[PDB]
Every structure is written in structure tokens, then in C-alpha cells.
Amino acid sequence: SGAIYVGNYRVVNRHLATHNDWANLVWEDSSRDLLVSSTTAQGCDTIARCDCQTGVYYCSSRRKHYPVSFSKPSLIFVEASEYYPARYQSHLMLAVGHSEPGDCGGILRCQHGVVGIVSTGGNGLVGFADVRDLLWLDEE
Ligand SMILES: CSCC1(CC(=O)N2CCC[C@H](C(N)=O)C2)CC1
Numbered sequence: 001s002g003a004i005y006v007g008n009y010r011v012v013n014r015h016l017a018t019h020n021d022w023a024n025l026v027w028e029d030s031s032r033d034l035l036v037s038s039t040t041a042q043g044c045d046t047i048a049r050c051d052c053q054t055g056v057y058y059c060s061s062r063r064k065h066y067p068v069s070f071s072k073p074s075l076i077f078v079e080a081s082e083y084y085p086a087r088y089q090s091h092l093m094l095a096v097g098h099s100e101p102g103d104c105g106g107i108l109r110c111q112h113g114v115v116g117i118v119s120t121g122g123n124g125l126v127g128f129a130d131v132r133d134l135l136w137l138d139e140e
């Protein structure tokens with residue numbers, strides 16, 4: 001579990017969104033595994049606006065933050081789950097790291113701020129839904 005809290009927005013994995021998230025919906029995209037809802041309180045996270053490929057992510061199944069090298073956001077095949085049918089998840093970045101079930105929502109960050117949230121993995125893989133192109137998170 002986990003979310004990004006920027007301005008009056010809460011960014012979560014679409015597959016983990018609550019009824020309150022759906023009832024206060026700003027934007028959602030199933031191909032990216034992302035959903036954004038509105039919040040009453042202002043958040044403290046800042047979004048990175050960059051092309052970094054190195055950063056650090058939080059792994060809840062290890063209680064640890066790990067430094068990683070990650071790929072650029074791409075259209076990458078994600079094996080079926082209980083959440084998604086084989087498909088192609090867009091704006092996804094991959095790294096070598098531990099992930100197991102339980103871990104989505106953990107933040108990936110670089111020197112500029114929040115880059116994205118854990119969305120996929122397995123294998124000694126971990127994939128990150130990017131948020132750096134969502135410029136509207138910084139306003140309104
Ligand atoms: C070994 S479990 C790896 C995970 C879970 C995992 O990959 N999926 C299950 C939930 C939906 C994910 C999606 N973004 O399509 C796929 C990352 C924590």
C-alpha cells in the first residue's frame with residue numbers, strides 16, 4: 001500500500017483505490033495502473049520533473065529503501081493477475097529489486113523529488129508507474 005500526497009491530490013495504484021477515492025475522483029487510467037483523488041488537506045510530496053534513471057524506492061516487504069537503476073517509461077508486458085489480464089502497461093519503468101505482493105504504492109524518488117510508485121515486479125524485478133509527465137499535479 002502507499003500513496004503520493006502532492007497539493008490537494010492523492011496518487012494511488014488504481015487497483016488499490018478505495019470507495020472514497022472513486023467518490024472524489026480526479027483522473028484514472030487503467031493502462032498505467034494510476035488513480036488520483038482529491039484531498040481536504042495539502043500534502044508534502046514534490047514531483048520530480050526530470051529524466052533520472054537512478055533513484056531509491058521503498059520496499060514494505062523488507063522495511064527498506066533500496067537504491068536502483070531503472071529503465072525509461074515504456075510499454076511493457078505484465079503477466080496476468082488477479083488485477084490485470086495479460087496486457088501492456090504503459091508508462092512503466094523496470095528495475096532489479098525485490099518485490100512481492102503487498103508492495104505496490106511504495107515511492108520511487110530521485111534527487112528532484114517523487115518519480116513514481118511501485119506497480120509491478122517478481123522475479124527480482126520491480127516496475128514503477130511513472131508520474132513525472134503529469135504536470136497538472138503541480139497546480140489547481
Ligand atoms: C511478486 S508480486 C509483484 C507485485 C504485484 C504485481 O506485479 N501485480 C499484481 C497487481 C497488479 C500489477 C499490475 N500493475 O499490473 C501486477 C509488484 C508487487
Ligand SMILES: [Zn+2]
Nearest residue numbers: 050052110112
Ligand atoms: Zn530526477
